[PDB]
């Protein structure tokens, strides 16, 4: 009868807000604006967010709350034929923890590297430097900046690895950092929601404090207005381009993370009659809103670099890890009270990651706990058994060629896997389970049915939206490359197994569960398309 519930409502919101808001809100969204026409970019971004983005986000939250179970069991009880979706999502989440947690390790490595009167990455005269070192970022590949060479030749030691075939030694300063991250994750997640629910109070909130003072510090710098100009100055010639819409579509989907099994897990500890429609609208908004603020943070400082430091905006305006571990720390080193801004920046970067790691792990734990009561009472031992597996294989990212391994998983593990998974999630919930059947479930919870708007999106828009992203993801596909290095064919094939191992669960479970039931062909489908609620 009983299932554990959130203590207080805020904990749930902070957990969702936390999982949702991460480094991609910082090192991706602002860049996309800059590249896509600035203020103009908000139109396709907004529409995509409205039609495909929020509906999927809303959907999984409602499902999580209604069915009251983790990913595996919930999709089993919804469309038994499609129960495979549960396994696909849990595996993906499993693969992702292997790499993503290392970003937090880097944040902590820099944090620990940040207590000095003079930051190590400011000059070119150190031992890890090369004769080609520059004070700041340029447009030539052979000549890097001071901050770039610090990250590459010192922190990473990536220069000593000839590719993925050669990982080299193990940096045990990085191993230490990765352990500390998993230690924190353990002591956060081992007691369940009662703890993890209140830990996210700090980790979800802290970033906004630091965003606040970095925003002021940024806008009070010379040339900060020039940054904002590059960031938001509207160009609508981009709007006609399909590539922009794809960029908006893709960003919205991967920033919100709908159908990732995390939202499902969190909402499953919700009280049945809780209003999840408000929770979805507020939570989504806060995510995009956070990205918007962060753009100001970044580009104010990026403008100051182009003004006082004499670097071309093109060169310093970047996405991904490069932005936060090189470009931004570079500007910080120049301004007064540098040691202060560096310390809170890398701490923000860490707490930005932590929120999301909890969710990912939680999706896995909750999913398994429900399907296997065997591990449900043993949870304190289980996540230890989990994070241990994480840490062990995670050591591959702490080697000198560890980035090559990291970059491999980043492209393959969750990229095309979760898209097809969520695509079936949409088709399951709407075409199979039915919208009217679904809408009825929601009315029982929050008292009123979903508007015809939400019902249209879940049915026609969602699949086309997902399909739209998937198609252009395949169209523009290129073999895996990092910098001047080109991954071997056997490396790509390895990733495709990782990409395919999750997705294959969908048909596998269907075919298997189909042969394991009695009756006709059409008689078996009705058995596997009958919800668990209808059988009572």
């Amino acid at each position, epitope marked *: 009868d009983e299932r554990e519930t959130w203590s207080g409502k805020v904990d749930f919101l902070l957990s969702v807000i936390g999982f949702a808001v991460d480094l991609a809100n910082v090192w991706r969204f602002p860049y996309l604006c800059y590249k896509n026409g600035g203020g103009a970019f908000l139109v396709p971004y907004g529409i995509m967010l409205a039609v495909g983005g929020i509906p999927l986000f809303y959907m999984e939250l409602a499902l999580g709350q209604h069915n009251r179970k983790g990913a595996i069991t919930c999709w089993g009880r919804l469309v038994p034929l499609f129960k495979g979706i549960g396994y696909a999502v849990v595996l993906i989440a499993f693969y992702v923890d292997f790499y993503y947690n290392v970003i937090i390790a880097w944040s902590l490595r820099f944090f620990f590297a940040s207590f000095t009167n003079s930051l190590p990455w400011t000059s070119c005269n150190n031992i890890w430097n090369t004769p080609n070192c520059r004070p700041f970022e340029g447009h030539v590949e052979g000549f890097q900046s001071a901050a770039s060479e610090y990250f590459n030749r010192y922190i990473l030691e990536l220069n000593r690895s000839e590719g993925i075939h050669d990982l080299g030694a193990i940096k045990w300063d990085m191993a230490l950092c990765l352990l500390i991250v998993y230690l924190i994750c353990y002591f956060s997640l081992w007691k369940g929601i009662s703890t993890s629910g209140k830990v996210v109070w700090f980790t979800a909130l802290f970033p906004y404090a630091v965003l606040l003072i970095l925003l002021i510090r940024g806008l009070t710098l010379p040339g900060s207005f020039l940054g904002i100009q590059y960031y938001l100055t509207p160009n609508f010639s981009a709007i006609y381009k399909a590539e922009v819409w794809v960029d908006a579509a893709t960003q919205v989907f991967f920033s919100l993370g709908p159908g990732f099994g995390v939202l499902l897990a969190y909402a499953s500890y919700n009280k049945y009659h809780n209003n999840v429609y408000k929770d979805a609208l507020l939570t989504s908004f806060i995510n995009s809103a956070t990205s918007f603020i962060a753009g100001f943070v970044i580009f104010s400082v990026l403008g100051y670099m182009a003004h006082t430091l004499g670097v071309r905006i093109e060169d310093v305006a970047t996405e991904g890890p490069g932005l936060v571990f090189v470009v931004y720390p570079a500007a910080i080193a120049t301004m007064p009270a540098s040691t202060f801004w560096a310390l809170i920046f890398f701490m923000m970067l860490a707490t930005l990651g932590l929120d999301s790691s909890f969710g990912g792990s939680e999706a896995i734990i909750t999913a398994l706990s429900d399907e296997f009561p065997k591990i449900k009472r043993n949870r304190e031992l289980f996540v230890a058994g989990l994070f241990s597996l994480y840490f062990v294989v995670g050591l591959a990212s702490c080697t000198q060629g560890g980035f090559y391994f990291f970059h491999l998983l980043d492209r393959y593990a969750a990229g095309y896997s979760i898209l097809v998974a969520v695509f079936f999630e949409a088709i399951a919930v709407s075409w199979i389970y039915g919208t*009217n*059947r679904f809408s*009825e479930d929601i009315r029982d919870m929050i*008292g*009123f*049915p979903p508007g015809r708007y939400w019902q249209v999106c879940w049915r026609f828009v969602a699949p086309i939206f997902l399909l739209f992203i998937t198609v252009y993801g395949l169209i523009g596909y290129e073999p895996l490359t990092y910098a001047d290095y080109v991954y071997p064919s056997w490396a790509n094939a390895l990733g495709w197994c990782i990409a395919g191992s999750s997705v294959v669960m969908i048909p596998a479970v269907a075919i298997f569960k189909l042969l394991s039931t009695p009756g006709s062909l059409r008689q078996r489908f009705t058995i596997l398309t009958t919800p668990w609620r*209808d059988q009572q």
Partner: antibody, heavy 119, light 109 residues
Framework: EVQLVESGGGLVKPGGSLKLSCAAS????????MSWVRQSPEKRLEWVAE????????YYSDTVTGRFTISRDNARNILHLEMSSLRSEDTAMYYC????????????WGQGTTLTVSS | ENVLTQSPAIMSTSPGEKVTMTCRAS???????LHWYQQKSGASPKLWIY???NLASGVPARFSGSGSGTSYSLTISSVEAEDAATYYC?????????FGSGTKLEMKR
């Protein structure tokens, strides 16, 4: 536009059984949860049972629970209340009332049909 | 079970006058779950106010409603003869669903 007509009902001896029906027209019956509300001859309103749009969620008042069964046919657009083990307290004007939204209440009512339980 | 009591039981009002009637619940009710019904004699009930401030279709502007928690009220600014009826408050907050005891409105003469 939308109309609701309660039918069946009349005199029944205590302990007996009777099936009340409601003919829905003028809207999409399938998309709306219905409810039976009765009014005693002392003119007191009492909610009886609610059935979902697809009838997959049923709620009863503790007074009729286990005796009354609420039911739907979305093909013929008819609401049913089948009663058993009728007591005298069951005597009332039985109303067929629509609403799908708890926040808006019951926006439409039938003319009502009268049930008398006496020996 | 959440019982809604209404007072007055009966009230007489001279046309043009202002009438206020109250509905109080044993347990708190969400302000958006409280509704009012007007039932004219020999007729079936009609939805009047829902969410406690919101008039239904055809309901003249002379009608208003307010309240929160366990306390709500229906007010008529300037009463008319076509306003004479019994008024029922209803709680949709939780099951079982309950109706108020009702307030019968009559005209002074």
């Amino acid at each position: 536009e939308v109309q609701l007509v309660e039918s069946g009902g009349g005199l029944v001896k205590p302990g007996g059984s009777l099936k009340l029906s409601c003919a829905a027209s003028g809207f999409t019956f399938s998309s709306y949860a219905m409810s039976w509300v009765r009014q005693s001859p002392e003119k007191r309103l009492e909610w009886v049972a609610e059935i979902s749009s697809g009838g997959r969620y049923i709620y009863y008042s503790d007074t009729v629970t286990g005796r009354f069964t609420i039911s739907r046919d979305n093909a013929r657009n008819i609401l049913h209340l089948e009663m058993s083990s009728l007591r005298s307290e069951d005597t009332a004007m039985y109303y067929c009332a629509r609403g799908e939204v708890r926040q808006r209440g019951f926006d439409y009512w039938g003319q009502g049909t009268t049930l008398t339980v006496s020996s | 079970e959440n019982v809604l009591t209404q007072s007055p039981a009966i009230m007489s009002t001279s046309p043009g006058e202002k009438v206020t009637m109250t509905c109080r619940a044993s347990s708190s009710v969400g302000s958006s779950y409280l509704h009012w019904y007007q039932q004219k004699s020999g007729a079936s009930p009609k939805l009047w106010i829902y969410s406690t401030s919101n008039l239904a279709s055809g309901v003249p502007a002379r009608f208003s409603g307010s309240g929160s928690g366990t306390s709500y009220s229906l007010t008529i600014s300037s009463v008319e003869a076509e306003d004479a009826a019994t008024y029922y408050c209803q709680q949709f907050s939780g099951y079982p669903l309950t109706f108020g005891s009702g307030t019968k409105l009559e005209m002074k003469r």
